[PDB]
Write a protein that binds this ligand. Structure first.
Ligand SMILES: OC[C@H]1O[C@H](OC[C@H]2O[C@H](OC[C@H]3O[C@H](OC[C@H]4O[C@H](OC[C@H]5O[C@H](OC[C@H]6O[C@H](OC[C@H]7O[C@H](OC[C@H]8O[C@@H](O)[C@H](O)[C@@H](O)[C@@H]8O)[C@H](O)[C@@H](O)[C@@H]7O)[C@H](O)[C@@H](O)[C@@H]6O)[C@H](O)[C@@H](O)[C@@H]5O)[C@H](O)[C@@H](O)[C@@H]4O)[C@H](O)[C@@H](O)[C@@H]3O)[C@H](O)[C@@H](O)[C@@H]2O)[C@H](O)[C@@H](O)[C@@H]1O
Ligand SMILES: OC[C@H]1O[C@H](OC[C@H]2O[C@H](OC[C@H]3O[C@H](OC[C@H]4O[C@H](O)[C@H](O)[C@@H](O)[C@@H]4O)[C@H](O)[C@@H](O)[C@@H]3O)[C@H](O)[C@@H](O)[C@@H]2O)[C@H](O)[C@@H](O)[C@@H]1O
Ligand SMILES: [Ca+2]
Ligand code: NA
Length: 699
């Protein structure tokens, strides 16, 4: 249909605020049209509001309706929004009423701060994320000048621009425009800062090496982070040291009061061991973040209670992981955040780590960084040996290449490889080259798109000609249809590469839908969206080596509506596991599992004071890894389910909501309860399972 968009002005509302629901419509049906748009808002199974407006439209013409509504008085509630326009079509969105984003955070990011970005454009990228996904907080990533001197001043004046550690130009006015825009959607701005990093040559800033942490007991090698140009490093300091606290806390305060941030997103480099202080005592670094964090929270709350938000990145998250118990149990954080690497690879493992962080933290919110399809060179592939190459030829003499071979000796002026690609729809494309380089140095090549120079791309030296990487990419705007993408070796380029393929880097809808379901069904959200509708492909946020296509965009809008509409059932302080032995689940005709086994329908049991909640995630046709790409699941329809309950509980009604079905609208189901040789039960037909169903049953 032609209900093109439904969204609200703001990403979160306080009780009593005025909410402006917008419906964008275009009659596409051939002739003129006369009917109504009927608005209905639910809190879970209940209708709390209904309203209707007349609408008529000459074929082709568009309009935007506004329905007003007043956020009800109960704080911390989520709502589903339906708009039904009869034969024009329907649409949906969702609304979050919370006076504090820290209970139901929907965390995005901003990582680009160019001088050329107008106030209007800053506002647009922000509105888009607020409107489509209800993003209520933004992590400002790599905005600071130095990790130990965050705002660059000349005497007493703020410098209008400054260069960051990777040489990017950061504009003050742009950062401020973006912070303003975040604030205009009732968003909050969290500033990225390390817990313990200076930059090189820190002495003249009055930072003392006595505050540092060392790899020896003789204070000769301070832990660093080498960015590999003989010049740019981080150095690491002791969280517990009072003079480092004093120094860096002061920089956090400076950033709140000068930039107008609402909090600090505190980061770290993850596990280090056999760590010493300056003098030489050996110390367990794992236990030392919480006293820093507690003290940081204290000066931030004293400085300004409204701009004192605080989280800390727990790196390498897993059950009983490094620093996992101490930080989640003892650190005065508003919400928990954890970047996942390789110690929770299965849906069920990460599911358990999330549960640990919910239980340790006292059921305060949990956000995961968990870069989807990280290792995968996912998307449509144009093999390099099936392209048009000038002065270079194919070969097969280094293993692991894809297809029938790869292009080699791409190594001198005049060499060329031109790909004939097709863009299935207008938009941004991630042009990703898989390559080899063992020249012992960076190899370059110039990139041309439809005959116009776009960028000189670097190809990184690897260990061995048999080590394929695919981290040479550039993102570009493309019109639907044919295009030409050409690497030329010209005069100014250096080195040499073998070239395996070009890929239109694309997040895989299927994996992405399934991981988000798993995450939120478990009790967590996912920092995955930012800047101008980008999805996060790597720890360095300005990476655009993969793009979303339109189909996944729509799925993400459904998902983010669903986790806002149903947040009381997903993340409330009284949502807990209910997997305590008394509850099996039966599904007729398909394999089911409670531990998220490959090729099954996974059921997860959670409960609250009033509802028995069973999630189904559909792993049929797919493996049990959360991060990797995946095929469409085996969709199911009219699927008999049987839920064994507690011997005591009594089910009034059975409800099923799914982001995959009607935008997340709750549909009530008919169910018969009896009892049999192997438990007391209830039973019903599940109309459909695609990726994720949430069954909530009211007792
Ligand atoms: O075709 C490719 C592109 O080619 C051109 O641009 C190339 C670059 O050009 C300029 O740089 C010139 C120099 O280029 C080389 O630089 C060497 C570096 O590159 C290699 O790494 C390749 C990866 O590059 C990116 O990843 C960067 C970086 O990200 C992280 O580290 C940075 C991060 O560190 C801390 O934060 C860590 C972490 O903290 C956690 O708590 C948080 O959860 C998490 O979010 C944070 O990430 C700091 O606190 C942060 O401030 C900071 O941001 C990551 O940890 C690190 O490993 C990673 O390297 C890409 O995203 C990725 O895809 C690549 O794999 C080397 O391997 C690396 O060692 C080295 O540092 C040459 O060696 C130099 O000689 C040369 O002078 C630009 O400055 C660069 O931005 C360009 O990439 C085209 O112009 C471009 O269009 C093409 O796309
Ligand atoms: O002292 C280092 C100098 O060489 C560096 O560049 C290395 C080569 O770069 C290009 O070739 C890349 C090529 O490398 C391997 O094969 C090289 C040899 O292997 C074959 O036997 C071939 O017949 C010989 O010509 C060649 O010696 C990979 O296996 C292959 O797939 C790669 O495509 C140039 O074409 C070569 O001339 C270079 O040797 C460095 O970059 C230079 O600056 C240094 O002078
Ligand atoms: Ca190939
Ligand atoms: Na998988």
């Amino acid at each position: 249909g032609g209900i093109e968009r439904v969204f609200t002005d703001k990403a979160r509302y306080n009780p009593g605020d005025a909410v402006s629901i917008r419906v964008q419509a275009k009659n596409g049906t051939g002739s003129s049209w006369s009917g109504a748009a009927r608005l209905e808002i639910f809190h879970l199974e209940n209708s709390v509001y209904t309203s209707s407006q007349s609408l008529s439209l000459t074929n082709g013409q568009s309009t935007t309706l506004t329905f007003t509504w007043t956020a009800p008085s109960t704080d911390f509630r989520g709502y589903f929004v339906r708009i039904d326009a009869g034969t024009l079509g329907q649409g949906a969105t969702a609304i979050d009423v919370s006076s504090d984003f820290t209970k139901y955070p929907r965390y995005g990011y901003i990582s680009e701060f160019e001088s050329g970005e107008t106030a209007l454009e800053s506002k647009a990228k922000v509105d888009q994320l607020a409107q489509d996904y209800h993003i209520n907080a933004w992590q400002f990533y790599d905005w600071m000048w130095r990790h130990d001197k965050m705002i660059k001043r000349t005497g007493g004046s703020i410098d209008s621009t400054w260069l960051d550690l990777f040489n990017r130009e950061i504009s003050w006015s742009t950062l401020q425009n973006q912070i303003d825009a975040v604030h205009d959607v009732n968003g909050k701005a969290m500033a990225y800062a390390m817990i313990y990093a200076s930059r090189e040559n820190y002495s003249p800033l009055g930072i003392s090496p006595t505050w540092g942490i060392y790899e020896d007991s003789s204070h000769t090698n301070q832990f660093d982070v080498d960015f590999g140009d003989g010049s740019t490093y981080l150095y690491m300091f002791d969280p517990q040291n009072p003079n480092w606290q004093n120094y860096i806390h002061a920089e956090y305060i400076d950033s709140i009061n000068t930039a107008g941030f609402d909090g600090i997103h505190v980061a770290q480099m993850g596990q280090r061991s056999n760590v010493y202080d300056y003098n030489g005592n050996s110390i367990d670094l794992s236990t030392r973040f919480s006293p820093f964090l507690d003290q940081a929270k204290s000066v931030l709350s004293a400085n300004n209670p409204a701009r004192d938000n605080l989280t800390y990145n727990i790196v390498d998250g897993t059950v009983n992981g490094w620093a996992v118990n101490d930080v989640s149990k003892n650190a005065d954080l508003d919400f928990l955040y954890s970047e996942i690497w390789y110690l929770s690879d299965s849906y069920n493992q990460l599911k358990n780590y999330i549960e640990q962080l919910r239980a340790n933290g006292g059921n305060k919110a949990v956000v995961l960084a968990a870069y989807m399809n990280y290792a995968d060179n996912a998307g449509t592939r144009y093999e390099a040996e099936s392209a048009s190459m000038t002065n270079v030829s194919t070969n097969t003499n280094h293993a692991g290449y894809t297809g029938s071979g790869f292009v080699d000796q791409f190594a001198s002026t005049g060499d060329k490889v031109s790909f004939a690609i097709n863009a299935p729809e207008a938009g941004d494309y991630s042009l990703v080259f898989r390559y080899g380089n063992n020249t012992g140095a960076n190899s370059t090549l110039n990139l041309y798109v439809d005959g116009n120079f776009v960028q000189k791309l670097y190809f990184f030296n690897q260990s061995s000609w048999g080590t394929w990487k695919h981290d040479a990419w550039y993102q570009v705007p493309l019109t639907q249809g044919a295009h030409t993408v050409e690497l030329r070796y010209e005069s100014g380029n250096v080195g040499a590469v073998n070239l395996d393929s070009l890929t239109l880097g694309t997040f895989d809808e299927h994996s992405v839908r399934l991981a988000d379901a798993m995450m939120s069904a478990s009790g967590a959200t996912h920092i995955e969206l930012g800047d101008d509708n980008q999805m996060l492909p790597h720890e360095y946020y300005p990476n655009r080596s993969k793009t979303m296509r339109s189909s996944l965009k729509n799925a993400m809008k459904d998902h983010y509506n669903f986790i806002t509409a149903y947040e009381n059932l997903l993340f409330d302080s009284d949502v807990v596991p209910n997997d305590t032995g008394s509850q099996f689940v039966n599904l007729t005709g398909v394999s089911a599992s409670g531990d998220g086994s490959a090729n099954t329908v996974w059921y997860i049991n959670k409960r609250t004071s009033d509802y028995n909640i069973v999630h189904l995630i559909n792993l049929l046709g797919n493996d049990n890894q959360w991060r990797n790409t995946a095929s469409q699941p085996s969709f199911q329809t009219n699927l008999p389910a049987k839920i064994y309950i507690g011997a005591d509980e009594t089910i009034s009604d059975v409800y099923l909501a799914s982001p995959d079905l009607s935008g997340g609208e709750t549909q009530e189901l008919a169910f018969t309860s009896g009892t049999d040789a192997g438990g007391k039960y209830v039973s019903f037909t599940v109309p459909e399972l695609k990726y994720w169903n949430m069954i909530y049953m009211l007792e």
